[PDB]
Short mmCIF file of C-alpha atoms in Angstrom, two decimals:
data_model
loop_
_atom_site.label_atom_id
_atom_site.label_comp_id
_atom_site.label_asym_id
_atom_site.label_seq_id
_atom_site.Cartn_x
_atom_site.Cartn_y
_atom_site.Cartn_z
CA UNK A 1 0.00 0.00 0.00
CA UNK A 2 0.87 3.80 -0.62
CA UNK A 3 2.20 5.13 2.71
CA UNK A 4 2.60 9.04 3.44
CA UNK A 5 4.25 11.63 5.74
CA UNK A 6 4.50 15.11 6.07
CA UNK A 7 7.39 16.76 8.22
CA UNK A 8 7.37 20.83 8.79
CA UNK A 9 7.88 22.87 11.88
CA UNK A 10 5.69 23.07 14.39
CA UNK A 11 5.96 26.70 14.86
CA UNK A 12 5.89 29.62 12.29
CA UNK A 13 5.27 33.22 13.30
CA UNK A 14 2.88 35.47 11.95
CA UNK A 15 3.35 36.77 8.57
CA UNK A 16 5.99 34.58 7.69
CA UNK A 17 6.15 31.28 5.35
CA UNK A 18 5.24 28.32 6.32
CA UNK A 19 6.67 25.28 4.77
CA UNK A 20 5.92 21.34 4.89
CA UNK A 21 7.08 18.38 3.33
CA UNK A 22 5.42 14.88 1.95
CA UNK A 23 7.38 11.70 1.47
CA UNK A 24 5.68 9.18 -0.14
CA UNK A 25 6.76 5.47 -0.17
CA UNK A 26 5.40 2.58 -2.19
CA UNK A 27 4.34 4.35 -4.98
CA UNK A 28 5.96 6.98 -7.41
CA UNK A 29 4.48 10.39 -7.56
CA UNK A 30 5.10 10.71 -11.32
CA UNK A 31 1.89 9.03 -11.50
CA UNK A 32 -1.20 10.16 -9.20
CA UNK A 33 -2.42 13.38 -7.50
CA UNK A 34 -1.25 14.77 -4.67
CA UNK A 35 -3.25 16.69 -2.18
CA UNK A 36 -3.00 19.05 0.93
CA UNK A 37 -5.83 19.39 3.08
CA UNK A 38 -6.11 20.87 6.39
CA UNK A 39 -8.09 20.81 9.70
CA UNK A 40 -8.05 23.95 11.91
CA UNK A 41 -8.81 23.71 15.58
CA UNK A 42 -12.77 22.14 16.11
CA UNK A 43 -13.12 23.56 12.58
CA UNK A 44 -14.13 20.83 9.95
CA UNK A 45 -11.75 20.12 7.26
CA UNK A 46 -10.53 22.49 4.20
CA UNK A 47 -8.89 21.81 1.15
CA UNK A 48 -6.23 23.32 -0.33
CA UNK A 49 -4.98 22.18 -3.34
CA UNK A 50 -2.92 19.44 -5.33
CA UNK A 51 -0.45 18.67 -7.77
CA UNK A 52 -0.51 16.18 -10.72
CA UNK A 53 1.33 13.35 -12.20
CA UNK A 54 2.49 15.96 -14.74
CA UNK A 55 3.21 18.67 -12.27
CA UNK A 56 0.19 20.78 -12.54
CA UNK A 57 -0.81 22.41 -9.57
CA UNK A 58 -4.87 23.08 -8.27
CA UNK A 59 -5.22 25.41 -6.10
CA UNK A 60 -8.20 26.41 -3.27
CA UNK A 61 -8.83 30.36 -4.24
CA UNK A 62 -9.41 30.77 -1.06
CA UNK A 63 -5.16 30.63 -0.91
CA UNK A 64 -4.17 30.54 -4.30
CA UNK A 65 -2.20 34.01 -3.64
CA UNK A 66 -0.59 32.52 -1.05
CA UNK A 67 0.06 29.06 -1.43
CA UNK A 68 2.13 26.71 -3.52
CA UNK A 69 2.64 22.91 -3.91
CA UNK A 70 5.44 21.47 -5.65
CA UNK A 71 7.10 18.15 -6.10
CA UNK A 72 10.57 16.67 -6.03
CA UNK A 73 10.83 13.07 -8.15
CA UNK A 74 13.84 12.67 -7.15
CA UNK A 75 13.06 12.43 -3.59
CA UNK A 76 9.81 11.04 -4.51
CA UNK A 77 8.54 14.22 -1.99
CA UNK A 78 6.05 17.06 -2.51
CA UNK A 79 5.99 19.95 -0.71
CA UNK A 80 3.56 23.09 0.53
CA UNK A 81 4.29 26.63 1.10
CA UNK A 82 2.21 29.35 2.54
CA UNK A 83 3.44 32.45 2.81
CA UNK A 84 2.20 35.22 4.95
CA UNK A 85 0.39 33.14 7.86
CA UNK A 86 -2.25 34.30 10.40
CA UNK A 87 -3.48 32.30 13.93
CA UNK A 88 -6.01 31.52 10.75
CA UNK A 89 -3.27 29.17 9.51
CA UNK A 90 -3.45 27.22 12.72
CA UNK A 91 -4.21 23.39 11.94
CA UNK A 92 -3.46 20.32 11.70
CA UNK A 93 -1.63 19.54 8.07
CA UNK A 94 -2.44 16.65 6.01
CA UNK A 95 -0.61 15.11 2.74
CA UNK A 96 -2.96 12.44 0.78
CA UNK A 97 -3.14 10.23 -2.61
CA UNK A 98 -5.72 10.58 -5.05
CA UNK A 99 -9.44 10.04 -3.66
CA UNK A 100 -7.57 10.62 -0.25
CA UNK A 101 -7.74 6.66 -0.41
CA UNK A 102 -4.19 6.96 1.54
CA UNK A 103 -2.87 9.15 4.24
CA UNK A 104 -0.27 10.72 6.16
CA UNK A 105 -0.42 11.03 9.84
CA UNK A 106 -0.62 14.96 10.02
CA UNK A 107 1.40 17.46 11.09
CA UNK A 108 0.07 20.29 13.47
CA UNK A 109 1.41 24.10 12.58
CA UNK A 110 0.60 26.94 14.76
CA UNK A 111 1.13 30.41 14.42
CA UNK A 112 2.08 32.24 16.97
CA UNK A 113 5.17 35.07 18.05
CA UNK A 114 6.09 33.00 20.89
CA UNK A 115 9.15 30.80 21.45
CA UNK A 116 9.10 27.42 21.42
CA UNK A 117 10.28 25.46 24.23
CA UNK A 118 10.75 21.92 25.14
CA UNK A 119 9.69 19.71 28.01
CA UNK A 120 10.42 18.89 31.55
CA UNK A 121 10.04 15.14 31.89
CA UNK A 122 9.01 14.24 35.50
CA UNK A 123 8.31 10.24 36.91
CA UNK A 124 4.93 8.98 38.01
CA UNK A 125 6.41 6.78 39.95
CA UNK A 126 4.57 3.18 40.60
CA UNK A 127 3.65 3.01 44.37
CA UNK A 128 1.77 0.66 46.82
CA UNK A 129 -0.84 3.75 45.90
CA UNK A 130 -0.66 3.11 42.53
CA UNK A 131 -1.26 -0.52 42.36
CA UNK A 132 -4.97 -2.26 41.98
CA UNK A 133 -4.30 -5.79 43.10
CA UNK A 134 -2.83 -7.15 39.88
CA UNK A 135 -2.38 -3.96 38.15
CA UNK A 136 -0.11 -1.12 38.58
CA UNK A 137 -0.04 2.16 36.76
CA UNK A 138 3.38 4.62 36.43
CA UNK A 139 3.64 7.11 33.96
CA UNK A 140 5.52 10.23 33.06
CA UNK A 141 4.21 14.02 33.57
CA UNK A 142 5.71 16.01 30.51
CA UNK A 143 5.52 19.68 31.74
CA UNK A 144 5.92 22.64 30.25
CA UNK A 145 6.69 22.95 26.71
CA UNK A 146 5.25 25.01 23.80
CA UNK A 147 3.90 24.57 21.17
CA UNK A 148 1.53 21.29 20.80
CA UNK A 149 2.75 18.20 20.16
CA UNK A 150 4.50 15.72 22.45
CA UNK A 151 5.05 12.24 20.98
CA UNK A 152 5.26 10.02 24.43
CA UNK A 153 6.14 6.63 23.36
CA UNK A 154 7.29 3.29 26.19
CA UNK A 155 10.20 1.50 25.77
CA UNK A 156 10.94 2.35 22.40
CA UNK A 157 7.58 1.54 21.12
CA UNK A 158 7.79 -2.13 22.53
CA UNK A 159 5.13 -1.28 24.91
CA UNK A 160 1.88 -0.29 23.47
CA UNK A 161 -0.95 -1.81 25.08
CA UNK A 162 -2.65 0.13 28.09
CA UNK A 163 -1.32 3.42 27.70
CA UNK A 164 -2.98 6.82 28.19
CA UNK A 165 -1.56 9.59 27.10
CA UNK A 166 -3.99 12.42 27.85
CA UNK A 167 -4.79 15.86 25.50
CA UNK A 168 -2.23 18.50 26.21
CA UNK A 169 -3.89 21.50 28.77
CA UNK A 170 -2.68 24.74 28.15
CA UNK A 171 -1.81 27.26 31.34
CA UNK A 172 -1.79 30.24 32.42
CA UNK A 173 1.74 30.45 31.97
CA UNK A 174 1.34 30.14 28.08
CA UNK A 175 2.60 26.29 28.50
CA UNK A 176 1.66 23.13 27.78
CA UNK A 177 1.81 20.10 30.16
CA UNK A 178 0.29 16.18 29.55
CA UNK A 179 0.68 13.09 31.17
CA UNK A 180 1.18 9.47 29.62
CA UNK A 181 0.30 6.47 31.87
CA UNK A 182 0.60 2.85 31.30
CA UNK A 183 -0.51 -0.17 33.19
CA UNK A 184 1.67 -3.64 33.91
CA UNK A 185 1.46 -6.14 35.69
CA UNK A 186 2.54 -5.49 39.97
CA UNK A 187 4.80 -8.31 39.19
CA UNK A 188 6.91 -6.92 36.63
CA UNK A 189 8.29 -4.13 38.75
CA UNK A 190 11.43 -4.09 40.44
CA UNK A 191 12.27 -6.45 37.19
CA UNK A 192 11.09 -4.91 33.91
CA UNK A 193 12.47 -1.70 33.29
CA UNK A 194 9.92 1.21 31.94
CA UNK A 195 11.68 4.16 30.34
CA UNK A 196 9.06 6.90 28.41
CA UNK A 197 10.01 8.58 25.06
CA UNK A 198 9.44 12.08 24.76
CA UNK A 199 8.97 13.43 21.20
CA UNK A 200 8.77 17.44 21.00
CA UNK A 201 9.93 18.36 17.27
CA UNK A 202 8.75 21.87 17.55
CA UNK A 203 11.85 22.37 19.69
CA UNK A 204 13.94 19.79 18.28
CA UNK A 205 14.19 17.84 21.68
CA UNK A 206 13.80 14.26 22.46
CA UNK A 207 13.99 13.09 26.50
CA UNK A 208 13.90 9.92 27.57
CA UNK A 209 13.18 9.09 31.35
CA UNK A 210 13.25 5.89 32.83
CA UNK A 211 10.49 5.08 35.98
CA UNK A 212 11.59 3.60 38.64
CA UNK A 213 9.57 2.28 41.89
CA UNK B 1 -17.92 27.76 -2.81
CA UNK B 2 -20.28 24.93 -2.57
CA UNK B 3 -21.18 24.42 1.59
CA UNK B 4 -21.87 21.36 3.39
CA UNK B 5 -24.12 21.19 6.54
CA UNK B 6 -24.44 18.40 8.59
CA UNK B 7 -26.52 17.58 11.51
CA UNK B 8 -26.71 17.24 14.44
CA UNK B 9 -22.77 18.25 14.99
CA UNK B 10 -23.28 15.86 18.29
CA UNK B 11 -24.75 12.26 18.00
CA UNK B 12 -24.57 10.29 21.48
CA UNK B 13 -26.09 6.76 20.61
CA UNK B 14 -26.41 3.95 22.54
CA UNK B 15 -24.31 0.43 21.74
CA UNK B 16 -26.44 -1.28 19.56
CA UNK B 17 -28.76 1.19 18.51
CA UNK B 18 -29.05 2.68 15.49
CA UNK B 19 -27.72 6.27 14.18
CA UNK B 20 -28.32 8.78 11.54
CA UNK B 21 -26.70 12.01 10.35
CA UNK B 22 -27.97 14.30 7.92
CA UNK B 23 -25.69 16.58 5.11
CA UNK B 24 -27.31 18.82 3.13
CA UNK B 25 -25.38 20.91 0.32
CA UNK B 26 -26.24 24.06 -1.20
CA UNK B 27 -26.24 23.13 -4.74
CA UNK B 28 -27.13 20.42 -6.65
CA UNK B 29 -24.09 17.37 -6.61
CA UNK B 30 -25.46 15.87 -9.67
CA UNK B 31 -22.68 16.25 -12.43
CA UNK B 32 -23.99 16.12 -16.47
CA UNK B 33 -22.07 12.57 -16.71
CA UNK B 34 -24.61 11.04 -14.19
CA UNK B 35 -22.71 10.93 -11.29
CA UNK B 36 -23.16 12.20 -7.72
CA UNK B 37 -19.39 12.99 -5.81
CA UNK B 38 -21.14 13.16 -1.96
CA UNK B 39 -18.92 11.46 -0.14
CA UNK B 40 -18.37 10.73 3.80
CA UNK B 41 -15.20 10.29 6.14
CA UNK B 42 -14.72 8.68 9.40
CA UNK B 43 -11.71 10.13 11.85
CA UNK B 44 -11.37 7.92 14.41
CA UNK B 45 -10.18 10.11 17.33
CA UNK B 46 -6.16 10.16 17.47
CA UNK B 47 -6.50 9.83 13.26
CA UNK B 48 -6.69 11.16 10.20
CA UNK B 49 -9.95 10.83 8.46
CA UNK B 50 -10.52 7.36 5.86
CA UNK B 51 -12.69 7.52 3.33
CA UNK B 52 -16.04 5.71 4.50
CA UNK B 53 -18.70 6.05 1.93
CA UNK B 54 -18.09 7.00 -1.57
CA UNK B 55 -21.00 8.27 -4.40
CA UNK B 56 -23.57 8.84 -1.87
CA UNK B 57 -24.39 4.92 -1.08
CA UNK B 58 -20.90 2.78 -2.22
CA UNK B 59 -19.35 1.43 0.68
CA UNK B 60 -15.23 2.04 0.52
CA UNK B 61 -12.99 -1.26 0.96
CA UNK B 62 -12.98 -2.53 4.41
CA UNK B 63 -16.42 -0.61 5.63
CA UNK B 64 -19.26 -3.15 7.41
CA UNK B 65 -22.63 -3.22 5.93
CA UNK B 66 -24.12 -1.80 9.17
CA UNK B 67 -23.02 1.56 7.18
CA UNK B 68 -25.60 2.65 4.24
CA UNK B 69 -25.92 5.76 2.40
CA UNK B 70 -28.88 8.00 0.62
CA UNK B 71 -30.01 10.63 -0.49
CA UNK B 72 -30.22 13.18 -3.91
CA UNK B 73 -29.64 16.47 -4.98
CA UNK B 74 -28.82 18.14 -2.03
CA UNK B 75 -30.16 16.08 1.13
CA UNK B 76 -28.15 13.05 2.41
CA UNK B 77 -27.90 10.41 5.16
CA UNK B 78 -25.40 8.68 6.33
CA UNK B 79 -27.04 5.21 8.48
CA UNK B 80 -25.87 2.87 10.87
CA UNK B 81 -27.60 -0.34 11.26
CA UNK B 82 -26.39 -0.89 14.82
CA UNK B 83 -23.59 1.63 16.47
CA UNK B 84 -20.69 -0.58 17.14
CA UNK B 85 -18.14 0.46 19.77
CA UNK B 86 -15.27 1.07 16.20
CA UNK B 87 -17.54 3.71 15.16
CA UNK B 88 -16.33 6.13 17.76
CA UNK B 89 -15.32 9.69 15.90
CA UNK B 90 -16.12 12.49 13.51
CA UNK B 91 -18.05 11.90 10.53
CA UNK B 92 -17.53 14.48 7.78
CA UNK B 93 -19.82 14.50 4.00
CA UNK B 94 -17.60 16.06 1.83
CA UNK B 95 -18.06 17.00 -1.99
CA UNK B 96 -16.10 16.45 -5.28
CA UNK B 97 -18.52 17.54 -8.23
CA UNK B 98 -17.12 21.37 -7.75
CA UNK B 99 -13.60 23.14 -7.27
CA UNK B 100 -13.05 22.94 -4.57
CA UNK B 101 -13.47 20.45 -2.64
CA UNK B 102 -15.59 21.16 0.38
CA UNK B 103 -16.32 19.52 3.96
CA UNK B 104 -19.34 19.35 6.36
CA UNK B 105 -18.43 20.57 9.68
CA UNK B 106 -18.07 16.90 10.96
CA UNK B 107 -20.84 15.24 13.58
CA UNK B 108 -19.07 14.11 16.61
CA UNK B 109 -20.56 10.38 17.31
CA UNK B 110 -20.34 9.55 20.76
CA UNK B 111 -20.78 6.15 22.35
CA UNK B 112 -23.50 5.34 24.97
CA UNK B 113 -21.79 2.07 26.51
CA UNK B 114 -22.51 -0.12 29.52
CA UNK B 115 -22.02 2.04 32.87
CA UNK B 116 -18.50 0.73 34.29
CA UNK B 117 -16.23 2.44 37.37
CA UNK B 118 -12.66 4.01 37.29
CA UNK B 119 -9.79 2.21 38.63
CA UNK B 120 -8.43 5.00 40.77
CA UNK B 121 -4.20 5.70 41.02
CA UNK B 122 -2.93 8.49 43.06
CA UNK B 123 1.24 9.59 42.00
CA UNK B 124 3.14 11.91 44.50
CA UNK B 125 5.63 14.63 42.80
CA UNK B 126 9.10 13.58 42.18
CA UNK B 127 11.76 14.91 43.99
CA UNK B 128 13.45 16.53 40.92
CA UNK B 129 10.20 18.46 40.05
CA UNK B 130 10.06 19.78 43.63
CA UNK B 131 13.49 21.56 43.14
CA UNK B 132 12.30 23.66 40.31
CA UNK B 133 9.79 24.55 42.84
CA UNK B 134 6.60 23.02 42.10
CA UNK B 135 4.68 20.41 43.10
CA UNK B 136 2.09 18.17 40.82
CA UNK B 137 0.08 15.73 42.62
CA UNK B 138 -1.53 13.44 39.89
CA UNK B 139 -4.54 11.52 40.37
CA UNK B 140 -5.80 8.71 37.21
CA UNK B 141 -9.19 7.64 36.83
CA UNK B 142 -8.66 4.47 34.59
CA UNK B 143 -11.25 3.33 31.78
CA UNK B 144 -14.53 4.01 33.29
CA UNK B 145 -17.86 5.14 31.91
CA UNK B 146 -19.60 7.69 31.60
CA UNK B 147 -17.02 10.62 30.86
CA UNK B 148 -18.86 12.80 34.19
CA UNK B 149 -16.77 11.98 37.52
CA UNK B 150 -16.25 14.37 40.46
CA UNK B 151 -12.25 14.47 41.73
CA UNK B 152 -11.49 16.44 45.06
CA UNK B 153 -8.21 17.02 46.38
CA UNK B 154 -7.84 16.82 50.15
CA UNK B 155 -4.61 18.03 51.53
CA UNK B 156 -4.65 16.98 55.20
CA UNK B 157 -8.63 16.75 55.60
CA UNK B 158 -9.14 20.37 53.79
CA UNK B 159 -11.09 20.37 50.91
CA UNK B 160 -8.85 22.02 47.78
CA UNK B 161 -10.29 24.54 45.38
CA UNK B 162 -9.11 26.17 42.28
CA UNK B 163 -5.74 24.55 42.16
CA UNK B 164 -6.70 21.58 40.03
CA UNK B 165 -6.85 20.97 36.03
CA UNK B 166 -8.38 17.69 34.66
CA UNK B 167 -7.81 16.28 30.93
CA UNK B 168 -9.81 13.47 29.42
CA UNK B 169 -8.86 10.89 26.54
CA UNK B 170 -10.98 10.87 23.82
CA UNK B 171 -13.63 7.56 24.18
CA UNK B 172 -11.49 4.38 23.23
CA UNK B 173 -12.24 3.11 19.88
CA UNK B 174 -12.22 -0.61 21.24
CA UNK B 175 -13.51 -0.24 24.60
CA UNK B 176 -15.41 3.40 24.49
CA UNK B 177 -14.30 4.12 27.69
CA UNK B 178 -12.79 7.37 29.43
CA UNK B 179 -9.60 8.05 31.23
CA UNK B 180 -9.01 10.96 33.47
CA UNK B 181 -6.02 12.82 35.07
CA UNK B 182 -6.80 15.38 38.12
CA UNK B 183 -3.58 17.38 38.63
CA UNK B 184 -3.08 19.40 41.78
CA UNK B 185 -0.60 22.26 41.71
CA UNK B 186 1.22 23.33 44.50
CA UNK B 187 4.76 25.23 45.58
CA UNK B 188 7.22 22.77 47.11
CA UNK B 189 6.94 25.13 50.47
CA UNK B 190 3.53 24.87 50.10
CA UNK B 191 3.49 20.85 49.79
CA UNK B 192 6.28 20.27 52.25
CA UNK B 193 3.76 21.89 54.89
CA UNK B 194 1.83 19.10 54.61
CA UNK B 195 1.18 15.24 55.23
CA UNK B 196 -1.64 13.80 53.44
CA UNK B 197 -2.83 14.15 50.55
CA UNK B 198 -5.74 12.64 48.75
CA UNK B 199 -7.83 11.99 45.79
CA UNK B 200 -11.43 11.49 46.00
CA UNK B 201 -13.55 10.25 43.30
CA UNK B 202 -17.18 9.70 42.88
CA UNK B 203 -19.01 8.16 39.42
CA UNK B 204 -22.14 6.45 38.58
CA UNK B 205 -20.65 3.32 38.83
CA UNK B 206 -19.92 3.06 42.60
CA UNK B 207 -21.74 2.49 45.41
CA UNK B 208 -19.74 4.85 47.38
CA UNK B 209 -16.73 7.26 46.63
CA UNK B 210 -13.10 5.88 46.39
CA UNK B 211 -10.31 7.58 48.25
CA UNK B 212 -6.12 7.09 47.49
CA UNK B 213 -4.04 8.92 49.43
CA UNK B 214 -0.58 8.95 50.22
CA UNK B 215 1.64 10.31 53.16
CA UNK B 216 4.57 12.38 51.93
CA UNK B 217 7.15 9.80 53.53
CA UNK C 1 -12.93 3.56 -7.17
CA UNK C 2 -13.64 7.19 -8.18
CA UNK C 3 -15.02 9.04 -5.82
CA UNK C 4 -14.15 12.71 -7.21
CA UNK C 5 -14.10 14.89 -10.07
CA UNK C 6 -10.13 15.40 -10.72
CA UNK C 7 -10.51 18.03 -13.52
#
């Protein structure tokens, strides 16, 4: 199957370009269209425009002035600029094959004049008061960073089932914090190690903590 | 260009039960060659959206028949036979007979399921954190339904207020059940004055509220 | 399966 990702900053501040990236494996983009869509905070979704097999470009005239998409075969990559960005421009990102039958993940862009910053990575440390009979939850409290997202992943991605890792709340303080949980077995502590895997691109930081009892 | 209107933007339905949301666009769909391009997307929460219907009534690849689609012109349902717990998320009608491309709003289907309790997990502050000079005090309500639960913090016996921020998952696509975090924010002075503290939870689906608490030693 | 108008 076609697989796609898109890979841009997190951040771009206000009337400046912004600029994203779609790699696409599987398939060759000589041959298909190539779309850019986007979904804006609780907003529905809107579409902006694609490119063609040959090159030709499509373009929502709501952005047209604004926007381009362009392709690299070589890299088997297309790309999208738009240039001169309001908090309107705020949204999540998305790359897609014709029909949108495939899909990239999405990439989340906000607009904004403030700094990014990266995370403080804190243990939620398994206790006697964090263990249900059989079952015992320990986590990782990721404080403090701007802008959205964090990635948390568990032991390299080995460890997938039962974790929580809960929407991002933004503070007073103009920062974001989250938590990511997971629940094991009581008798794997002491014994299995549990290390969390903080993503934060935006800032170009990655943290890894490991949770002890 | 061309808008799309769904309704209602908010569809609770109960497992089992059937479900129906309405798009209506505000021009005709129906291209010269005989073909309608109404179309409709699930996003499963934590995803991008897949394309769930195509043409107004053609199932994609991979969609149950519980799904069915109607409609002409300008007024269209999308059906569910019986909700099933996968069908958590937005559902969006787009359209692809004009330039561009437009999307409904999206309805946000949410999952009446059977009534079940949190597990409850309380998690002091590190030491680290407390030398930057703050103190979080988590407390997790684990997979429990429905998403309304009442968290109070008690810091040796007193009853906290206005120091606490809670964050729910999204319903679980498998299991459509919540989680919740209560995080209480203190200064390290302000926590080291202090023994006990507690987390106190009470939900529909206990008989009486559940306490964990630990003792700062 | 064509779900879209493409020109």
């Amino acid at each position: 199957q076609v697989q796609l990702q898109e890979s841009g900053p997190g951040l771009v501040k206000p009337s400046q370009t912004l600029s994203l990236t779609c790699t696409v494996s599987g398939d060759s983009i000589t041959s298909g269209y190539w779309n850019w869509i986007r979904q804006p905070p609780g907003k529905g979704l809107e579409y902006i425009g694609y490119i063609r097999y040959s090159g030709r470009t499509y373009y929502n005239p709501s952005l047209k002035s604004r926007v381009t998409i362009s392709r690299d075969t070589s890299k088997n990559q297309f790309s999208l600029k738009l240039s001169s960005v309001t908090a309107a421009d705020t949204a999540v990102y998305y790359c897609a094959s014709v029909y949108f039958t495939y899909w990239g993940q999405g990439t989340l862009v906000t607009v904004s004049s403030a700094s990014t910053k990266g995370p403080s990575v804190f243990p939620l440390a398994p206790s006697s008061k964090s263990t249900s009979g059989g079952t015992a939850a320990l986590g990782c409290l990721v404080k403090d960073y701007f802008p959205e997202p964090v990635t948390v992943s568990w032991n390299s991605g080995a460890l997938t089932s039962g974790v929580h890792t809960f929407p991002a709340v933004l503070q007073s303080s103009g920062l974001y914090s989250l938590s990511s949980v997971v629940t094991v077995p009581s008798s794997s502590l002491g014994t299995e190690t549990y290390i969390c895997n903080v993503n934060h691109k935006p800032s170009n930081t990655k943290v890894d903590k490991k949770v002890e009892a | 260009d061309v808008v799309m209107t769904q309704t209602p933007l908010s569809l609770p339905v109960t497992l089992g039960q059937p479900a129906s949301i309405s798009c209506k666009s505000s021009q005709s769909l129906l291209d010269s060659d005989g073909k309608t391009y109404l179309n409709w997307f699930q996003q499963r929460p934590g995803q991008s959206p897949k394309r769930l219907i195509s043409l107004v009534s053609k199932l994609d690849s991979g969609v149950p028949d519980r799904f069915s689609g109607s409609g002409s012109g300008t007024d269209f349902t999308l059906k569910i036979s019986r909700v099933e717990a996968e069908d958590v998320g937005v559902y969006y009608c787009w359209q692809g007979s004009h330039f561009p491309y437009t999307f409904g709003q999206g309805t946000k289907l949410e999952i009446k399921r059977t009534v079940a309790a949190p597990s409850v997990f309380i998690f002091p502050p590190s030491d680290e954190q407390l030398k930057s000079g703050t103190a979080s005090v988590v407390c997790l309500l684990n997979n429990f339904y429905p998403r309304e639960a009442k968290v109070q913090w008690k810091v040796d016996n007193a009853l906290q207020s206005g120091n606490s921020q809670e964050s729910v998952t999204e319903q679980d696509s498998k299991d459509s059940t919540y989680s919740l975090s209560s995080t209480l924010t203190l200064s390290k002075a302000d926590y080291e004055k202090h023994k006990v503290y507690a987390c106190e939870v009470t939900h529909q689906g206990l008989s009486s509220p559940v306490t964990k608490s630990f003792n700062r030693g | 399966i064509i779900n879209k108008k493409l020109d």
